[PDB]
Amino acid sequence: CYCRIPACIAGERRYXTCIYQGRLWAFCC
């Protein structure tokens, strides 16, 4: 899985949010 801003994209599944590099991201798989 990985972190994306602002949103996960088609084909992915979101499981909450990353706090990574001092930023908030969607956690996408």
Added chain:
Amino acid sequence: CYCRIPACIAGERRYXTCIYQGRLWAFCC
């Protein structure tokens, strides 16, 4: 990367945190 409780596993290190299902998780890569 993965979000884990309680901790990262072998082959991974912590790169931040996740928020999912009302809890904080280790962000592991």
